Design a binder for this molecule. Structure first.
Ligand SMILES: Nc1ccn([C@H]2C[C@H](O)[C@@H](COP(=O)(O)O)O2)c(=O)n1
Ligand SMILES: Nc1ccn([C@H]2C[C@H](O)[C@@H](COP(=O)(O)O)O2)c(=O)n1
Ligand SMILES: *[C@@H]1O[C@H](CO)[C@@H](O)[C@H](O)[C@H]1NC(C)=O
Ligand SMILES: *[C@@H]1O[C@H](CO)[C@@H](O)[C@H](O)[C@H]1NC(C)=O
Ligand code: NA
Ligand SMILES: [Zn+2]
Ligand SMILES: [Zn+2]
Ligand SMILES: [Zn+2]
Length: 267
């Protein structure tokens, strides 16, 4: 996601973690503000574009070698690659937090988990084609951009009604109520089914495979003839909106559940 989407995921997670989880995270981050997770949600995207952080660029995605829109699927060995991927990073950084929660590595590990659980839920972060859709140029409300970027940024910002922090917080709030009592409330139990703190690869693969299904059902279903040539602020946005809203909600809820498990490590 872009900045607003990561902030939204983080605020959702803040609303669903247990209090002891909040304390566990605030202690690592050195921040007990109202925005303790949101303040670090976008960090990994800023860090990766430096000499120090470049090793972590692969950790934002898993380049599924499927054939969308006619065939979607993710396979960890096939798709992760030797430089690593979102799934391998969730394993590594989760295990750092389970083994070494107050060592020097914990702070970055936590910021990576907050960010990457968000990224796994953006379907094009679970797809190889054209570098996760970065190579597919499109027009969005008259602007030339690419398909990856509209899923990260243009469409979530349109749906939220802006780009600023207050806009992200309002959007998170909306999605938290959909989880608690509204349109996602009957599904949220399923969203945490299968979560296993002793198996971060399997756990995060549930989420990656889930998000990847939407590559075929929503991202690329229209075909590139249409996608390359039509302004995607029209019907493409209209049908995409409920999909990315539910995926952002899932990301925040799953992030909260995962943080609860890390903070509850037997100790
Ligand atoms: N050439 C680029 C492309 C993207 N980004 C940043 C801004 C985007 O919002 C973010 C996207 O990261 P991710 O795809 O991991 O969500 O990375 C950047 O600084 N430079
Ligand atoms: N195979 C890839 C390559 C990139 N990205 C994401 C991470 C980058 O932040 C963003 C923009 O890519 P780039 O850095 O190539 O401009 O897209 C992705 O999800 N899948
Ligand atoms: C795990 O994270 C540490 C700290 O960033 C890094 O040194 C190491 O290479 C990572 N390992 C894997 C397999 O991602
Ligand atoms: C769509 O654009 C891509 C480049 O992003 C190109 O390879 C492909 O041939 C185009 N397809 C159609 C049907 O226009
Ligand atoms: Na249910
Ligand atoms: Zn992102
Ligand atoms: Zn992205
Ligand atoms: Zn990222």
């Amino acid at each position: 996601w872009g900045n607003l989407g990561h902030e939204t995921v983080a605020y959702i997670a803040q609303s669903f973690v247990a209090s002891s989880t909040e304390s566990f995270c605030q202690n690592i981050l050195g921040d007990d503000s109202t925005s303790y997770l949101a303040n670090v949600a976008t960090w990994a995207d800023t860090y990766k574009y430096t000499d120090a952080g470049e090793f972590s660029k692969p950790y934002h995605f898993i380049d599924a070698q499927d054939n969308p829109p006619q065939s979607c699927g993710v396979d960890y060995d096939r798709d992760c690659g030797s430089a690593g991927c979102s799934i391998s990073a969730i394993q590594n950084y989760t295990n750092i937090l389970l083994e070494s929660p107050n060592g020097s590595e914990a702070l970055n590990a936590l910021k990576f988990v907050v960010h990457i659980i968000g990224d796994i839920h953006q379907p094009l972060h679970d797809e190889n084609l054209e570098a996760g859709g970065n190579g597919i140029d499109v027009t969005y409300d008259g602007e030339t951009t690419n398909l990856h970027h509209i899923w990260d940024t243009n469409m979530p910002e349109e749906a939220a009604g802006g780009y600023s922090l207050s806009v992200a917080k309002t959007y998170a709030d909306l999605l938290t109520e959909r989880i608690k009592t509204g349109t996602y409330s009957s599904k949220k139990d399923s969203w945490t089914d299968g979560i296993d703190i002793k198996d971060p690869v399997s756990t995060s693969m549930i989420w990656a495979a889930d998000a990847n299904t939407y590559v075929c059902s929503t991202v690329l279903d229209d075909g590139l003839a249409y996608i390359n040539s039509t302004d995607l602020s029209g019907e493409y946005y209209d049908k995409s909106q409920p999909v990315f809203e539910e995926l952002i909600a899932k990301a925040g809820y799953r992030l909260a559940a995962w943080l609860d498990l890390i903070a509850s490590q037997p100790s």
